[PDB]
Amino acid sequence: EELVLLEEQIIFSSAGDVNVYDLQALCDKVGWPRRPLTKIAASLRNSYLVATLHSVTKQLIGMARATSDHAFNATIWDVLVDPSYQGQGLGKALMEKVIRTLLQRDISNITLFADNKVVDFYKNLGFEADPQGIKGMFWYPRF
């Protein structure tokens, strides 16, 4: 559940205790538009998994979460690493521990939706786009 990955030491956790203001700040640094904090809070309590990287010298520096039906499917959302800490393998390690936690829970199929600029990053983790022509689709997206 709580594990040191690096040594300042970077700690992984799947406790899911994220302060919504800390997450907002982290989303600001990576240039994300703000979303209502009560909604962020709702999304955290109702995610199947909330996985965090913290920097204790505790500062939140990464997050990934997933939705799931606890059986067949889990979809990963909102993966981000503090840009001051990128390039050090911390995103790659966050995702690995997320995938492994979901496999540990026997979830048959792990899914995500990837921006074009970050598709190769997911390929290198074992994700595969449009398997056998399956298409990811959104309802009237505004991106």
Q: Is 37 in the site for a copy of itself (CB under 8 A)?
A: no
SS3 category, 32:
coil
User: What is the bridge-based pairing of β-strands 59-68 and 73-81?
Assistant: antiparallel
Q: Do the beta carbons of residue 23 and residue 40 sit within 8 Å? A: yes
Within 55-74, the residues that bind a copy of itself by CB under 8 A are 65, 67-73
Please tell me whether residue 39 adopts helix, strand or coil conformation: helix
Could you say which of 77, 83, 84, 89 contacts a copy of itself (CB under 8 A)?
A: 77
Least distance from C-beta 39 to a copy of itself, angstroms? 4
Under the binding rule (CB under 8 A), the answer on residue 46 touching a copy of itself is yes
Residue with tokens 């709702």: 42
Q: Which residue in 130, 66, 54, 131 sits closest to 95, CA to CA?
A: 66
* Contact with a copy of itself (CB under 8 A) among 6, 11, 27, 40: 40
Active site residues: 122
Q: Please give the distance of CA 120 from its chain centroid, rounded to a whole number.
A: 16
Is residue 2 within the footprint of a copy of itself (CB under 8 A)? no
Say how many residues make up the chain.
143
If one asks whether residue 132 binds a copy of itself (CB under 8 A), the answer comes out as: yes
Binding site for a copy of itself (CB under 8 A): 35, 39-40, 42-43, 45-47, 65, 67-73, 75, 77, 99, 109-116, 119, 122-123, 125-141, 143
